[PDB]
Amino acid sequence: QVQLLGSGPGLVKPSETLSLTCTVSGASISSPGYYWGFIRQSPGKGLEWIGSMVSGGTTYYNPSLKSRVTISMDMSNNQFSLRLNSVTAADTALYYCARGSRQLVRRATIDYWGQGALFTVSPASTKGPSVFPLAPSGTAALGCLVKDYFPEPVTVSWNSGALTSGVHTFPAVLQSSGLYSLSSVVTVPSSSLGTQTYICNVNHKPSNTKVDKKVEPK
Amino acid sequence: SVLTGPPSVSAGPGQQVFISCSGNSSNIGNNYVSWYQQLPGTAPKLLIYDSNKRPSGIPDRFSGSKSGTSATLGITGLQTGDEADYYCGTWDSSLSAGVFGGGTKLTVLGQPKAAPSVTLFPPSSEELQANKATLVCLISDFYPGAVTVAWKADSSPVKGVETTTPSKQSNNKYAASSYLSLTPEQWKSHRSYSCQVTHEGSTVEKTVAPT
Ligand SMILES: *[C@@H]1O[C@H](CO)[C@@H](O[C@@H]2O[C@H](CO)[C@@H](O[C@@H]3O[C@H](CO)[C@@H](O)[C@H](O)[C@@H]3O)[C@H](O)[C@H]2NC(C)=O)[C@H](O)[C@H]1NC(C)=O
């Protein structure tokens, strides 16, 4: 019941400051016995330790990043935060809020990883997506197409998260214009069309925009 | 990277596999080692901590060991689900910081061929009303993960085609997609459009038409 929720994926312009805030639920961030930190991962590469704060105690940093990172805690709001300054495109990565138990020194074990949030360092501006339905024509495939957005990611759920059996949300394509598109398709019983409503929920957190589209038979 | 290990490892189902990570007295030699599993598209998951202990819910097939300045993740009785990236982690006394190894991908040998499931969508009426047309070819559940996609308008079109590299699915198969960008006039001007997916010596073609 101890949960971590980050401030979500985001675009950061080159030379500006990457700011990530993680909120703790089910425990106090001030309580000794846990340590809280950040890890990042480039999209097809390995894990890189950024730093970690021992609750009640000491903060430790990757010496390779220390000169441009600040890790802080806000106990009043039960939050902890990362500032990564002077970013360049090399800083594009999944950033994870992370927790460990007991002593950090000599161990550094992460027993709970947050979801991970893509931060894209780019001077191109954000653009929210246009959503189009892919109508169906013993099972039926229906979907929605999410076109022309930047940066990644878009997340898609169906029927506000109620429906996920048979959901396949495909990796995005990078267009030559530098925008992304993706599709999400769900396979449902044909006999369900006409009584069951199907709605795709397309979340583009980087532009703080969500679009829901009812997908009906032709 | 301060730790060394094999970039990739294979084995058969039912066998036991070792994954080693090597360092020195400043990290692995004198500190505790942890191991993490990362499935496609998900955050890592802790498998071993304090070098040989398993958290609750980690099956007994996974074991950990440390000798000298190297640590070893063992997986006895390999399963198709074990297919994943594996990372060793420790504390470095020189750096006063946690460090990770480069990671090892684990593939399970003997996976059978699976033909791609192909679904092709015509442009929706709303997109046409925005004066655009996109044909959407979705390709799933194929193995091995190599496919080629071509498009036809009775003949071969290559402009306006954008196709993804294949990406591993949760059931250890692959998926890919291809899009064909047309004008509404181009879409209505031809009798049909087709997406052709070639996989291991067989092709599956799906066709749609404006009529
Ligand atoms: C434990 O292993 C680490 C990791 O190899 C050792 O630190 C490393 O020591 C080497 C050799 O002196 C450093 O070599 C240098 O490589 C850099 C490029 O990274 C190059 O720019 C230098 O001119 C030199 O060739 C290496 O960077 C260094 N890595 C660090 C400090 O992170 C450490 O010395 C080993 N400890 C013991 C007790 O053996």
Side-chain angles (χ1 to χ4, degrees), chain B residues 1-2 23-27 92 94-95:
Chain B
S1 209
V2 85
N24 55 26
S25 57
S26 302
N27 37 78
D92 197 300
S94 295
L95 311 179

mmCIF file of all heavy atoms in Angstrom, chain B residues 1-2 23-27 92 94-95, ligand 1:
data_model
loop_
_atom_site.group_PDB
_atom_site.id
_atom_site.type_symbol
_atom_site.label_atom_id
_atom_site.label_comp_id
_atom_site.label_asym_id
_atom_site.label_seq_id
_atom_site.Cartn_x
_atom_site.Cartn_y
_atom_site.Cartn_z
ATOM 1 N N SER B 1 29.518 2.551 -17.034
ATOM 2 C CA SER B 1 29.461 1.181 -16.510
ATOM 3 C C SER B 1 30.754 0.760 -15.795
ATOM 4 O O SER B 1 31.852 0.891 -16.343
ATOM 5 C CB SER B 1 29.154 0.188 -17.640
ATOM 6 O OG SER B 1 28.450 -0.950 -17.158
ATOM 7 N N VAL B 2 30.608 0.241 -14.575
ATOM 8 C CA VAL B 2 31.741 -0.214 -13.773
ATOM 9 C C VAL B 2 31.738 -1.728 -13.563
ATOM 10 O O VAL B 2 32.749 -2.280 -13.092
ATOM 11 C CB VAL B 2 31.795 0.523 -12.414
ATOM 12 C CG1 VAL B 2 30.899 -0.155 -11.367
ATOM 13 C CG2 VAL B 2 33.231 0.643 -11.909
ATOM 14 N N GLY B 23 33.276 -7.353 -10.992
ATOM 15 C CA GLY B 23 33.701 -6.015 -10.550
ATOM 16 C C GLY B 23 35.039 -6.089 -9.841
ATOM 17 O O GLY B 23 35.961 -6.726 -10.382
ATOM 18 N N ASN B 24 35.134 -5.470 -8.680
ATOM 19 C CA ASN B 24 36.374 -5.551 -7.877
ATOM 20 C C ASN B 24 36.066 -5.269 -6.409
ATOM 21 O O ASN B 24 34.889 -5.108 -6.094
ATOM 22 C CB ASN B 24 37.462 -4.634 -8.414
ATOM 23 C CG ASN B 24 37.037 -3.193 -8.546
ATOM 24 O OD1 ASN B 24 36.153 -2.706 -7.855
ATOM 25 N ND2 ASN B 24 37.695 -2.523 -9.455
ATOM 26 N N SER B 25 37.115 -5.213 -5.578
ATOM 27 C CA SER B 25 36.987 -4.951 -4.122
ATOM 28 C C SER B 25 36.198 -3.667 -3.825
ATOM 29 O O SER B 25 35.667 -3.579 -2.705
ATOM 30 C CB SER B 25 38.338 -4.942 -3.450
ATOM 31 O OG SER B 25 39.193 -3.976 -4.042
ATOM 32 N N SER B 26 36.136 -2.698 -4.750
ATOM 33 C CA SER B 26 35.395 -1.485 -4.409
ATOM 34 C C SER B 26 33.890 -1.636 -4.559
ATOM 35 O O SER B 26 33.140 -0.829 -4.000
ATOM 36 C CB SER B 26 35.859 -0.301 -5.261
ATOM 37 O OG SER B 26 37.248 -0.074 -5.102
ATOM 38 N N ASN B 27 33.422 -2.646 -5.269
ATOM 39 C CA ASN B 27 31.980 -2.835 -5.337
ATOM 40 C C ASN B 27 31.594 -4.258 -4.932
ATOM 41 O O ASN B 27 31.378 -4.529 -3.743
ATOM 42 C CB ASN B 27 31.459 -2.475 -6.734
ATOM 43 C CG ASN B 27 32.420 -2.880 -7.855
ATOM 44 O OD1 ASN B 27 32.495 -4.055 -8.248
ATOM 45 N ND2 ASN B 27 33.120 -1.889 -8.417
ATOM 46 N N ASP B 92 29.084 0.900 -4.739
ATOM 47 C CA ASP B 92 30.497 1.129 -4.972
ATOM 48 C C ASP B 92 31.045 2.074 -3.915
ATOM 49 O O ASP B 92 30.615 3.241 -3.825
ATOM 50 C CB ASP B 92 30.763 1.687 -6.368
ATOM 51 C CG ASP B 92 32.217 1.547 -6.756
ATOM 52 O OD1 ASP B 92 33.087 2.106 -6.049
ATOM 53 O OD2 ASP B 92 32.499 0.819 -7.724
ATOM 54 N N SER B 94 34.091 3.307 -3.815
ATOM 55 C CA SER B 94 34.881 4.391 -4.393
ATOM 56 C C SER B 94 33.991 5.559 -4.791
ATOM 57 O O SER B 94 34.299 6.724 -4.510
ATOM 58 C CB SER B 94 35.656 3.883 -5.612
ATOM 59 O OG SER B 94 36.619 2.913 -5.243
ATOM 60 N N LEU B 95 32.884 5.251 -5.454
ATOM 61 C CA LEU B 95 31.928 6.229 -5.938
ATOM 62 C C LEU B 95 30.955 6.700 -4.867
ATOM 63 O O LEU B 95 30.311 7.741 -5.073
ATOM 64 C CB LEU B 95 31.158 5.643 -7.131
ATOM 65 C CG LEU B 95 32.017 4.991 -8.222
ATOM 66 C CD1 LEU B 95 31.178 4.419 -9.364
ATOM 67 C CD2 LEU B 95 33.057 5.980 -8.758
HETATM 68 C C1 LIG C 1 37.562 -1.182 -9.798
HETATM 69 O O1 LIG C 1 37.073 -1.126 -11.104
HETATM 70 C C2 LIG C 1 36.885 0.192 -11.543
HETATM 71 C C3 LIG C 1 36.207 0.214 -12.894
HETATM 72 O O2 LIG C 1 37.082 -0.231 -13.924
HETATM 73 C C4 LIG C 1 38.226 0.901 -11.486
HETATM 74 O O3 LIG C 1 38.099 2.242 -11.826
HETATM 75 C C5 LIG C 1 38.687 2.504 -13.107
HETATM 76 O O4 LIG C 1 40.100 2.480 -13.105
HETATM 77 C C6 LIG C 1 40.587 2.593 -14.437
HETATM 78 C C7 LIG C 1 42.062 2.204 -14.605
HETATM 79 O O5 LIG C 1 42.918 3.096 -13.905
HETATM 80 C C8 LIG C 1 40.192 3.941 -15.048
HETATM 81 O O6 LIG C 1 40.934 3.908 -16.265
HETATM 82 C C9 LIG C 1 40.738 5.064 -17.051
HETATM 83 O O7 LIG C 1 39.658 4.946 -17.947
HETATM 84 C C10 LIG C 1 39.209 6.235 -18.320
HETATM 85 C C11 LIG C 1 37.949 6.078 -19.161
HETATM 86 O O8 LIG C 1 36.948 5.627 -18.257
HETATM 87 C C12 LIG C 1 40.335 6.989 -19.013
HETATM 88 O O9 LIG C 1 39.786 8.275 -19.279
HETATM 89 C C13 LIG C 1 41.522 7.121 -18.058
HETATM 90 O O10 LIG C 1 42.606 7.829 -18.676
HETATM 91 C C14 LIG C 1 41.972 5.710 -17.641
HETATM 92 O O11 LIG C 1 42.443 4.889 -18.695
HETATM 93 C C15 LIG C 1 38.645 3.969 -15.061
HETATM 94 O O12 LIG C 1 37.884 5.058 -15.632
HETATM 95 C C16 LIG C 1 38.169 3.825 -13.630
HETATM 96 N N1 LIG C 1 36.726 3.988 -13.515
HETATM 97 C C17 LIG C 1 36.166 4.674 -12.561
HETATM 98 C C18 LIG C 1 37.090 5.406 -11.646
HETATM 99 O O13 LIG C 1 34.983 4.672 -12.402
HETATM 100 C C19 LIG C 1 38.804 0.917 -10.099
HETATM 101 O O14 LIG C 1 40.070 1.537 -10.226
HETATM 102 C C20 LIG C 1 38.932 -0.526 -9.664
HETATM 103 N N2 LIG C 1 39.373 -0.629 -8.301
HETATM 104 C C21 LIG C 1 40.376 -1.435 -7.982
HETATM 105 C C22 LIG C 1 40.796 -1.435 -6.538
HETATM 106 O O15 LIG C 1 40.936 -2.152 -8.798
#
